Ligand binder design. Structure first.
Ligand SMILES: N[C@@H](CCC(=O)N[C@@H](CS)C(=O)NCC(=O)O)C(=O)O
Ligand SMILES: N[C@@H](CCC(=O)N[C@@H](CS)C(=O)NCC(=O)O)C(=O)O
Lengths: 306, 306
């Protein structure tokens, strides 16, 4: 009956959602940067056994017969498309169906990520920024890497501040450029985007990570956008004043984070490219997929110089 | 009454078109690479006084009321749009109108360039490859730079051979990528495109120009495509396996040719970008113009190292 799903896992008494192992399930798309945040945290914090995940198909399809709604769909079998698995948990065929199964009063969009609860058969949370916070603290009793803290108290002020202008300028900014229907609004977003990127470039020139000498939540939010920049945003969203490849610091910075154990696991460039170029006949009518620079992010970087 | 306009200026007896000064007129668009070939030759060979030129508006508009045909149009006045001038010669309002005025039996496309004859009130030629040949030899009696030969006999074999695979792979190849409606054909064009570009890169690593140590016709045909690559082809036509900026030889090679006296005169990046992104609601519905890297091609190059 809920109109929104913004609840939290909690190690507190009288909590609807305690951090039990095998209880929760993460629904994602490799293509979506926001969902990719959560996949990164599962590997970084070592929550693989605690929380399994399933990825939908990259290209949108029709979710129902009665209306022409387009969105995320699950494959019918494991062999239908690489990187995608059917929803064996609830037998759903689309993300939309999972929401409807949780509540007929849901008023939001049918988006990923989705943190599902197997016990109450409901959606705990569908906000990536919140999912990664509870992935960072609430599962430390069973996390393979409990010590690792991406949101330590002494950084929260700087992380929240960084997240601020990085969200508006970069994470969400690339979409402002792509969804712009007028020249003025486009240039506003593009200008502000490369102001933010230059700002990052200067920071990462003095230190290894965006908020100091250690990895933080801010780095994961930034990385998921950068890893998609030259292949998608630079063409699909017309963000071409400068490519990531041309930012020496951010470029090696992306390689560095990509090469962190378990991170490359969460980058599926096929799903990334297939989704953006294949699910928007508005912006890309014939659904052609650019060749792309095909950069090897496993290749050497210079970020150890710090 | 002619169905085609493929005639030649000639210093021969009994020739319909002798190379008289002030007799012929060149109609172009700064945006079109093929037309830009001819502008380059006018400045290189020093034919400014001999042959005047007029540029149409970059963005296509309706040419008639009775049908919805879109194409080149002249401004009504000199102040309507920079880089464009009205057709004061024949008072035409579109390129289409110039063709119809030449012959009601014309069966080709209403394209630029157009080499017009003021005497017979007709179109001499509308093929860029041919226009530049007669710009190179037939006006040497009045050319400010008569000595300069871009198609000297001892290079014709190599120039024609270079022009061969450069036309299919690069000059026309970028369009094969952009007009591709299917993935397979796109990848064919994109693959073949970057095979040709790599081939150029290797050549220009051993020598200054594409056909040896001196500028030739082959260089002008290549340059007009390269100067448009990162701003247009790399995004609009999805040619993004590699940007020109990333080819050190071809990149400086483009700067070198750009800086040849009178060449920069023929590069109007505004017209270039406005046309491609503004005249195809098919490929680019909202007609948004990417910010673009805004490269200064007047900046220093390393091509004198030869
Ligand atoms: N606020 C959400 C954003 C999630 C989101 O925008 N997801 C996109 C994928 S990139 C989506 O599933 N969109 C589906 C739709 O709008 O139809 C978060 O940060 O987690
Ligand atoms: N074969 C011609 C090609 C000219 C050409 O394709 N021009 C284009 C501009 S890039 C044009 O005027 N197209 C107009 C149309 O097709 O409607 C040449 O090499 O000169």
């Amino acid at each position: 009956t809920a109109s929104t799903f913004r609840n939290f896992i909690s190690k507190e008494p009288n909590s609807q959602f305690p951090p039990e192992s095998g209880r929760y399930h993460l629904y994602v798309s490799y293509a979506c940067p926001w969902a990719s945040r959560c996949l990164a945290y599962l590997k970084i914090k070592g929550l693989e056994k605690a929380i399994a995940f399933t990825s939908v198909k990259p290209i949108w399809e029709r979710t129902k017969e009665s209306d022409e709604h387009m969105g995320w769909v699950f494959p019918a079998s494991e062999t239908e498309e690489a990187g995608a698995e059917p929803d064996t948990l609830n037998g759903a065929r689309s993300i939309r169906e999972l929401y409807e199964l949780a509540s007929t009063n849901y008023a939001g969009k049918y988006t990923v990520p989705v943190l599902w609860d197997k016990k109450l058969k409901t959606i705990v949370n569908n906000e990536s920024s919140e999912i990664i916070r509870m992935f960072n603290t609430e599962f430390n009793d069973i996390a393979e890497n409990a010590a690792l803290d991406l949101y330590p108290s002494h950084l929260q002020a700087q992380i929240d501040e960084t997240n601020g202008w990085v969200y508006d300028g970069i994470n969400n900014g690339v979409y402002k450029c792509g969804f712009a229907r007028k020249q003025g609004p486009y240039e506003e977003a593009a200008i502000q985007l490369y102001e933010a990127l230059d700002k990052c470039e200067e920071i990462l020139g003095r230190q290894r990570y965006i908020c100091g000498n250690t990895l933080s939540e801010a780095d994961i939010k930034l990385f998921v956008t950068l890893i998609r920049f030259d292949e998608v945003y630079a063409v699909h969203f017309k963000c071409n004043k400068k490519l990531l490849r041309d930012y020496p610091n951010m470029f090696n910075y992306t390689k560095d984070i990509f090469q962190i154990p378990g991170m490359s696991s969460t980058v599926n460039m096929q799903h990334i490219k297939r989704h953006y170029y294949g699910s928007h006949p508005t912006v890309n009518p014939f659904g052609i997929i650019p060749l792309g620079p095909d950069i090897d992010y496993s290749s050497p970087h210079d970020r150890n110089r710090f």
